[PDB]
Design a protein around this ligand. Sequence first.
Ligand SMILES: *[C@@H]1O[C@H](CO)[C@@H](O)[C@H](O)[C@H]1NC(C)=O
Ligand SMILES: *[C@@H]1O[C@H](CO)[C@@H](O)[C@H](O)[C@H]1NC(C)=O
Ligand SMILES: *[C@@H]1O[C@H](CO)[C@@H](O)[C@H](O)[C@H]1NC(C)=O
Length: 606
Amino acid sequence: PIKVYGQVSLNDSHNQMVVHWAGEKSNVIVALARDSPKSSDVYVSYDYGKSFKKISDKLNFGLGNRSEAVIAQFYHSPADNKRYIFADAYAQYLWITFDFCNTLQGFSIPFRAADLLLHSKASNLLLGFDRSHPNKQLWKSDDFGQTWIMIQEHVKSFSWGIDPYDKPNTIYIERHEPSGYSTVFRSTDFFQSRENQEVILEEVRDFQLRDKYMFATKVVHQQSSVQLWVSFGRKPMRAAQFVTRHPINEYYIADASEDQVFVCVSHSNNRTNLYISEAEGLKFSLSLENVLYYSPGGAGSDTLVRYFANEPFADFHRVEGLQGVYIATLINMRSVITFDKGGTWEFLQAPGCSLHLAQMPILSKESAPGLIIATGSVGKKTNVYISSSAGARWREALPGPHYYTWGDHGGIITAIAQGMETNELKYSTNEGETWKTFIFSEKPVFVYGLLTEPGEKSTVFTIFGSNHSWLILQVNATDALGVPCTENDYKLWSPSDERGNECLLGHKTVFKRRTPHATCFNGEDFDRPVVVSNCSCTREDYECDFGFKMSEDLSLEVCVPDPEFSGKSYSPVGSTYRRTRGYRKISGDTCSGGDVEARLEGELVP
Ligand SMILES: *[C@@H]1O[C@H](CO)[C@@H](O)[C@H](O)[C@H]1NC(C)=O
Ligand SMILES: *[C@@H]1O[C@H](CO)[C@@H](O)[C@H](O)[C@H]1NC(C)=O
Ligand SMILES: *[C@@H]1O[C@H](CO)[C@@H](O)[C@H](O)[C@H]1NC(C)=O
């Protein structure tokens, strides 16, 4: 029903191992073994993981130099999955391949390659940032790392532009300056001429680019305070309004991907406050207080929080595949979820008790709309919890901590116990309502990774671990799904909140998906909603207005005046101006008509 078709032990005793399939239409897998750096090894499969060949000896410093290569990091081009760069940890040196590591060539380079930033569309183009010097130099290559020019020195921060919003080759940069105040510049010819260069904002402290938005900071006064500046869709930057009684030291941009900005301000007692804007990103309202926040700390002069997306400091998580849905943890903790980008929040429940989600991460994808797997616990021992209702309802799927992944649009889910040795793969074809066991090897292993072969329809899983000696297995589970799904095996589904509203963000979205109990191969792409239709407005289409905050008791769902406004939340006796009741329609909400829209919307006042 399921078979292990590839199993390979690498006579290798490094303490880290990463394994990456080249991509969806590809038989190549690259594996990199590293320490915690003291040594490394590289292995490549050209047969879907049936066999791996050691190719570390191809990574050498050339004729008459025998000193061993030590790979810190490798990089895969997202524009061309045949291309890789392996960077030496110590020497100023790279190896590049254009053919899945069949041929590698070494190149000595004028900096150590701490961080390379490969362009997402132009496969020859990349940046390199020399972080070892305090001299802070940005290097650019247009031949995939063979030759490099130094395009900017004294770099405080920089970023590639983003398509489609920026012209081709766009780079944004800000330099360190003796005064501490600096200019954000944009160039389309790598800073080679005045004519292809543009001032974006001046007297800036920091800057960041995130999707359609750009953020920068200035200082105002009389204690000084940091003012946030924002651009939406590459229009000129404008000052955001953040009214508080006390100085703001920094902003954390938590998310800017759904036509609004979530921003966190303050980090007292490992808590922060979550604010949301409308589309322009300029008028923020307090959506959620006391969100868990843990950072390692920084030098003390950062005004925009730097962090990696896969390691957010705020316990706040966008659910993929769905607009509107985010999950957070607040504080004696509680997990909450929103279905309307922070307009209202609800407590998560399992069978009911309060469900607390440790964010082992939350797994969700556009290829399986409404399916979420997460790790957490109930009351007061971690288990695996599953929702197939976009987080509205949850069940406990498996007890104990596990790796989990899935294939074929969520139609087959796999799980392996973590933190103990095992030779057991759990699999479910019904969203975790039942599970079968497949013994994937005779002897137990500590498992360190569980992956799905890329491709939305894939039903091949990679397992790697050891008992130190690395083992890599490939499990083909295709036959566990049997024959192709037919019309009988699909049902219409609309995401809803916990109350049953299938009307989210002012419209009803309809997906065609495979029923929970159908055992069949789903060969269809139904990732994109079949029907969308508008609804009459409800409370759920509204959020707190500038000057207001969510009631402390979230279940009241009432917006009240924010004390930070010092009693001036409602300030303008003439004409017919529009006085807010505390609410504004959520950015991108398409609701229309009905009772609620009236007297949630502003009041006409003389
Ligand atoms: C070999 O060449 C590399 C890269 O140029 C250099 O960094 C290293 O010092 C060399 N090692 C020896 C033993 O000559
Ligand atoms: C897995 O099994 C299916 C059905 O037998 C086959 O079509 C598919 O190519 C296999 N995949 C791999 C990577 O062996
Ligand atoms: C729903 O409303 C939006 C504007 O709010 C409009 O653009 C869209 O055409 C409407 N869609 C449907 C399917 O009626």
